[PDB]
Design a binder for this molecule. Structure first.
Ligand SMILES: [Ca+2]
Ligand SMILES: [Ca+2]
Ligand SMILES: [Ca+2]
Lengths: 218, 224
């Protein structure tokens, strides 16, 4: 008989994750995930030629990083120069039967690896859960906003880089409309309105058609 | 000394897991998990001295394994003899940036390892994805009931086998009335396991506990 059975030794009381760009908690191990378990996800740099990243370990159901429990922090340095998004940093959360959490960060290109060990009531747990359930909508809105923001900032930077290396190819009126749309996006990014930013991204995208060809023709 | 960001925004459309004992889907990677990601969990054999396990890979939200889509299957052979629950088999689901799912299984005692690669589009299409979601919300209560029933059944099966082993395990320092009453409770439990009622089975487990004091004592002395 070829059957396999689930070992259930324990469950996690709260979500476990790391802080990512925009000050948001990104979950590696969700609440009520069976223990022992090993989850890992791949992340990247937020800047061109960024040489190091900070892993800030968080516990809780809130979306804003400061609104959760801070478990620990460590750095991964020696990341080889590359555009943002290029380096691949694998972050692993490993929970054993002892309930002891191990967090590691590993660069796949350079092989460099760093890690920490994190040790460790019901009233505080339930307070965190209730507090999360009370603010749930604001938290969701914040999360979506952050994602939209990072996307927009990316769009802004990339479009400006291609505009600078475009000339003198890129024509007059196109460059004017593009720069105006870029300014518009930049102002939208400071706001709390997700829809306005989506709108500005779309607007910048619709005056940007020629840029693609120009960069492609070399 | 700067910010770290999510590499891809892509997420898994449906849960990914394997079939476990009782024909139930156990999820390794939940629906809407960001990619690339790697999840691993430890499982074991369901029978004594079992030499192999079948890893049956499933995609979907249903609790009955067959109600989900089968992605692929492979066997992990060469498992050294041991009681059920003893071998430690680590199953890993790894989705890369390309969205390709790699499933591996490794027995820790024997070091044996087997794996398969599952391509995208060997899963459900967008329409099928939405259909699966609807079907799961429609059947959620029944699926949950089936799942709980399966867990209860497996606990009961364990108790049955273990108690019968204790009788087998010496096991006749056990007197007249006791062996009979225990075997009767075991038969009652075993027939209850055939039923669809979780509470009835739990009841038979407790009742079996009420006839087992002498077994407990004898075994306690023999081990100690
Ligand atoms: Ca099975
Ligand atoms: Ca994960
Ligand atoms: Ca950060």
């Amino acid at each position: 008989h070829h059957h396999i059975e689930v070992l259930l030794l324990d469950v996690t009381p709260l979500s476990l994750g790391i802080e990512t760009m925009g000050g948001v908690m990104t979950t590696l191990i969700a609440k009520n995930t069976t223990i022992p378990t090993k989850h890992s996800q791949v992340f990247s740099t937020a800047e061109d030629n960024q040489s190091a990243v900070t892993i800030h370990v968080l516990q809780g159901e809130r979306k804003r990083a400061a609104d959760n429990k801070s478990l620990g922090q460590f750095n991964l340095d020696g990341i080889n120069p590359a555009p943002r998004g290029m380096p691949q940093i694998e972050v692993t959360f490993d929970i054993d039967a002892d309930g002891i959490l191990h967090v590691s960060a590993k660069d796949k290109n350079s092989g460099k690896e760093q890690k920490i060990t994190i040790k460790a009531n019901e009233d505080e747990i339930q307070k965190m859960v209730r507090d999360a359930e009370a603010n749930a909508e604001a938290d969701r809105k914040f999360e979506e906003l952050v994602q939209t923001r990072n996307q927009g900032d990316h769009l802004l930077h990339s479009t400006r880089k291609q505009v600078e290396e475009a000339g003198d190819k890129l024509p007059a009126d196109d460059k004017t409309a593009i720069e105006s749309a870029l300014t518009a996006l930049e102002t939208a990014l400071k706001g709390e309105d997700k829809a306005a930013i989506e709108a500005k991204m779309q607007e910048l995208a619709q005056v940007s058609q020629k840029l693609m060809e120009i960069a492609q023709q070399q």
